[PDB]
Amino acid sequence: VPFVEDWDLVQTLGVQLAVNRVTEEAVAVKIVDMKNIKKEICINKMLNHENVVKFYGHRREGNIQYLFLEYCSGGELFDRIEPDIGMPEPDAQRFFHQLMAGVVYLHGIGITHRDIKPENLLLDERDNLKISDFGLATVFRYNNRERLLNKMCGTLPYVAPELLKRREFHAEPVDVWSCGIVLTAMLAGELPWDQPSDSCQEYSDWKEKKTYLNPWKKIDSAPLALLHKILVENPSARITIPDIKKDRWYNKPLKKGA
């Protein structure tokens, strides 16, 4: 079939929406003028999960790299979060379930995302959540051997406190922490602090258990109890994903089917 390899770029997504000339299939094409991306492509080639943005392949033409990726027509989770309100608890729990599934998957293959936030969590036409953008992602386990991380990266309001305090740290608790900040945002429509430092008053308040303040006062006791287990300063004491899956709120029936 002639023309089947031709794509019309029709709209900027943040990354272009590309539509196939013949089939009308929509994909996202990430255009990166190399005048970093080799690692992103390498990691993307490893990924196959329903809650991770699918990678279809790539083509380079001179200096511009083109990554062909899963198109998520529901846009960013960020835009489902109403400022100062958040979203309905059942929607937040469903999104949180899907986020955990994606992160369990990545961690199982030894990959850490390192920049989980609502801007990077995309939604398909059925509002299924997809983890996107592996530009900051890295290998933390290879040949069944863990490598400790030392590079400071991510996004300050979402970063775990150990990344600011310690020279080296385990990868998995950092992604757990960012998922907790995402959950807070979904349930309160606000981020709890600028960054998790002892200099940050809102972070000190949390450590002193002042949950009569915002954002915490807006969050029901059940999800709040989970957040108390996730947003724990010591990453060794922090809840792991297998234990998140046993959490009372995590397992609370809330949401009807589509």
Which residues fall in the annotated binding site? Answer: 13-15, 30
- Does 81 bind ligand 3XL (CB under 6 A)? Our answer is no
- Does 172 bind ligand 3XL (CB under 6 A)? Our answer is no
Q: Which stretch binds ligand 3XL (CB under 6 A): 8-16, 92-100, 153-161, 185-193?
A: 8-16
* Of 17 and 104, CB closest to ligand 3XL: 17
Q: 111: helix, coil or strand?
A: strand
DSSP 3-state helix, strand, coil percentages of the chain (rounded to 5)? 35, 20, 45
Q: How far is the CB of 14 from ligand 3XL (least distance, A)?
A: 5
Q: 29: helix, coil or strand?
A: strand
Calpha distance 220→129 (Å, rounded) = 23
* Of 70 and 233, CB closest to ligand 3XL: 70
Binding residues for ATP: 13-15, 30
Q: How far is the CB of 148 from ligand 3XL (least distance, A)?
A: 26
Residue of 84, 115, 124, 220 marked active site: 115
Determine contact, residues 131/102, Cβ cutoff 8 Å: yes
- Does 123 bind ligand 3XL (CB under 6 A)? Our answer is no
- Does 137 bind ligand 3XL (CB under 6 A)? Our answer is no
Nearest to 122, CA basis, from 193, 113, 108: 113
Identify residues 22-51 at the interface with ligand 3XL (CB under 6 A). 28, 30
Amino acid at 107: H
CA 257 to chain centre: 24
DSSP string covering 195-207:
SS-TT-HHHHHHH
* Of 28 and 176, CB closest to ligand 3XL: 28
Q: Which stretch binds ligand 3XL (CB under 6 A): 10-18, 103-111, 171-179, 190-198?
A: 10-18
- Does 122 bind ligand 3XL (CB under 6 A)? Our answer is yes
Q: 169: helix, coil or strand?
A: strand
Calpha distance 183→89 (Å, rounded) = 10
Binding test (CB under 6 A) with ligand 3XL, winner from 51, 65, 132, 184 = 132
Count Cβ atoms within 10 A of the Cβ of residue 250 and give its class: 0-12 exposed, 13-18 middle, 19 or more buried.
Answer: middle
Q: Is 124 a catalytic residue?
A: no
CA distances, 228 to each of 32, 97, 146, 161, 162 (Å): 40, 18, 27, 15, 17
* Of 70 and 190, CB closest to ligand 3XL: 70
Catalytic residues: 115
Contacts with ligand 3XL, residue ranges (CB under 6 A): 13-15, 28, 30, 53, 69-72, 75-76, 122, 132-133
